[PDB]
Write a protein that holds these residues in place. Structure first.
Motif, short mmCIF file in Angstrom:
data_model
loop_
_atom_site.label_atom_id
_atom_site.label_comp_id
_atom_site.label_asym_id
_atom_site.label_seq_id
_atom_site.Cartn_x
_atom_site.Cartn_y
_atom_site.Cartn_z
N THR A 51 0.85 -1.19 0.00
CA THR A 51 0.00 0.00 0.00
C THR A 51 0.89 1.25 0.00
N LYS A 52 0.42 2.28 -0.69
CA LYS A 52 1.27 3.40 -1.01
C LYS A 52 1.66 4.26 0.20
N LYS A 53 2.93 4.69 0.17
CA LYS A 53 3.47 5.52 1.23
C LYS A 53 3.08 6.96 1.00
N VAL A 54 3.22 7.78 2.05
CA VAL A 54 2.94 9.19 1.94
C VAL A 54 3.97 9.85 1.01
N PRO A 55 3.52 10.53 -0.06
CA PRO A 55 4.50 11.21 -0.94
C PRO A 55 5.41 12.19 -0.19
N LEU A 56 6.71 12.18 -0.49
CA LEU A 56 7.58 13.22 0.02
C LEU A 56 7.61 14.33 -0.99
N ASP A 57 6.67 15.24 -0.82
CA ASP A 57 6.50 16.35 -1.77
C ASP A 57 5.98 17.55 -1.03
N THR A 58 5.77 18.67 -1.72
CA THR A 58 5.35 19.90 -1.04
C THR A 58 4.02 19.73 -0.28
N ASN A 59 3.11 18.92 -0.82
CA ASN A 59 1.84 18.66 -0.16
C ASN A 59 1.89 17.90 1.15
N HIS A 60 2.98 17.18 1.40
CA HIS A 60 3.04 16.34 2.60
C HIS A 60 4.24 16.61 3.47
N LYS A 61 5.11 17.50 3.02
CA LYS A 61 6.31 17.81 3.81
C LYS A 61 6.02 18.17 5.26
N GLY A 116 -11.66 18.22 -3.29
CA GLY A 116 -10.66 17.41 -2.60
C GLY A 116 -10.26 16.20 -3.42
N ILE A 117 -9.67 15.22 -2.74
CA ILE A 117 -9.15 14.03 -3.39
C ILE A 117 -9.92 12.82 -2.90
N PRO A 118 -10.82 12.32 -3.74
CA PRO A 118 -11.66 11.24 -3.22
C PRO A 118 -10.86 9.97 -3.08
N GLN A 132 -5.46 15.91 10.18
CA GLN A 132 -5.10 16.92 9.17
C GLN A 132 -5.17 16.40 7.73
N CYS A 133 -5.05 15.09 7.52
CA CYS A 133 -5.13 14.54 6.14
C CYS A 133 -6.48 14.77 5.43
N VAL A 134 -7.55 14.80 6.23
CA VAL A 134 -8.97 14.93 5.78
C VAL A 134 -9.22 16.24 5.08
N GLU A 135 -8.39 17.23 5.37
CA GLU A 135 -8.48 18.53 4.70
C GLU A 135 -8.53 18.39 3.21
N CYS A 136 -7.72 17.47 2.69
CA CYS A 136 -7.61 17.22 1.26
C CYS A 136 -8.22 15.90 0.84
N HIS A 137 -8.03 14.87 1.66
CA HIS A 137 -8.48 13.54 1.35
C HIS A 137 -9.87 13.30 1.92
N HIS A 138 -10.88 13.54 1.10
CA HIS A 138 -12.24 13.38 1.56
C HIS A 138 -13.14 13.05 0.40
C1 HEM Z 1 -1.95 13.23 6.25
C2 HEM Z 1 -0.86 13.03 7.07
C3 HEM Z 1 -1.91 12.68 4.81
C4 HEM Z 1 -1.71 11.40 4.42
C5 HEM Z 1 -1.48 10.12 5.26
C6 HEM Z 1 -1.71 11.37 2.97
C7 HEM Z 1 -1.54 10.25 2.21
C8 HEM Z 1 -1.53 10.22 0.82
C9 HEM Z 1 -1.38 9.04 0.00
C10 HEM Z 1 -1.20 7.62 0.57
C11 HEM Z 1 -1.41 9.40 -1.29
C12 HEM Z 1 -1.32 8.52 -2.57
C13 HEM Z 1 0.08 8.55 -3.15
C14 HEM Z 1 0.23 7.60 -4.31
O1 HEM Z 1 -0.74 7.27 -5.05
O2 HEM Z 1 1.40 7.15 -4.47
C15 HEM Z 1 -1.59 10.83 -1.28
C16 HEM Z 1 -1.69 11.59 -2.39
C17 HEM Z 1 -1.96 12.91 -2.46
N1 HEM Z 1 -2.23 13.78 -1.40
FE1 HEM Z 1 -2.07 13.21 0.60
N2 HEM Z 1 -1.96 12.68 2.53
C18 HEM Z 1 -2.08 13.50 3.63
C19 HEM Z 1 -2.34 14.83 3.56
C20 HEM Z 1 -2.59 15.54 2.41
C21 HEM Z 1 -3.00 16.95 2.41
C22 HEM Z 1 -3.29 17.80 3.66
C23 HEM Z 1 -3.10 17.31 1.11
C24 HEM Z 1 -3.48 18.69 0.52
C25 HEM Z 1 -2.61 19.70 0.66
C26 HEM Z 1 -2.75 16.17 0.31
C27 HEM Z 1 -2.73 16.14 -1.06
C28 HEM Z 1 -2.42 15.07 -1.85
C29 HEM Z 1 -2.32 15.05 -3.30
C30 HEM Z 1 -2.48 16.22 -4.28
C31 HEM Z 1 -2.02 13.63 -3.71
C32 HEM Z 1 -1.77 13.10 -5.14
C33 HEM Z 1 -0.33 12.62 -5.34
C34 HEM Z 1 0.62 13.71 -4.94
O3 HEM Z 1 0.79 14.65 -5.75
O4 HEM Z 1 1.20 13.64 -3.82
N3 HEM Z 1 -2.45 15.09 1.13
N4 HEM Z 1 -1.68 11.31 0.00
#
Ligand code: HEM
Ligand code: HEM
Ligand code: NA
Length: 70
Positions: free
Chosen positions: A3-13, A42-44, A31-37
């Motif tokens: 299962t996919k790890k949290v991206p190391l990018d500007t959105n998750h730094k 948001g990101i369904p 805090q993840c729910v802000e975007c992931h909802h």
């Molecule tokens: C909160 C701590 C948090 C988690 C956990 C999380 C997880 C997560 C996953 C597992 C993915 C999928 C990556 C993949 O398919 O390889 C993913 C992707 C994205 N997210 Fe996220 N995320 C958390 C927080 C947040 C927040 C607060 C935002 C908005 C600012 C956000 C956004 C995104 C976006 C855009 C993606 C798409 C892939 C990418 O560009 O990183 N996440 N997240």
């Protein structure tokens, strides 16, 4: 499969940084729910993705590990 790890990018730094500083995973999960909802916006989650529990937040970090970890 894996299962996919949290991206190391500007959105998750900030979560990587908070985690490194001692933040609890439940507080971070909230805090993840802000975007992931669900719709609209948001990101369904994909079809079949787990849905949120009654008590406390969906435990994102339990299934989706940060990278760069030991
Ligand atoms: C909160 C701590 C948090 C988690 C956990 C999380 C997880 C997560 C996953 C597992 C993915 C999928 C990556 C993949 O398919 O390889 C993913 C992707 C994205 N997210 Fe996220 N995320 C958390 C927080 C947040 C927040 C607060 C935002 C908005 C600012 C956000 C956004 C995104 C976006 C855009 C993606 C798409 C892939 C990418 O560009 O990183 N996440 N997240
Ligand atoms: C917590 C609210 C949480 C987030 C955020 C999150 C993110 C997430 C995304 C963005 C995807 C899509 C990945 C892609 O685009 O390929 C995704 C998919 C899966 N998830 Fe998740 N997820 C959160 C919570 C949880 C929990 C609590 C679990 C385990 C019980 C879990 C697991 C999975 C699995 C398995 C998938 C499909 C495989 C994958 O793409 O990683 N998620 N999740
Ligand atoms: Na967790």
């Amino acid at each position: 499969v894996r299962t996919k790890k949290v991206p190391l990018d500007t959105n998750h730094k900030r979560f990587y940084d908070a985690f490194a500083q001692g933040a609890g995973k439940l507080d971070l999960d909230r805090q993840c729910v802000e975007c992931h909802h669900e719709k609209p916006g948001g990101i369904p989650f994909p079809k079949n993705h787990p849905v949120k529990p009654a008590d406390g937040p969906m435990r994102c970090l339990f299934c989706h590990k940060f990278k760069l970890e030991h």
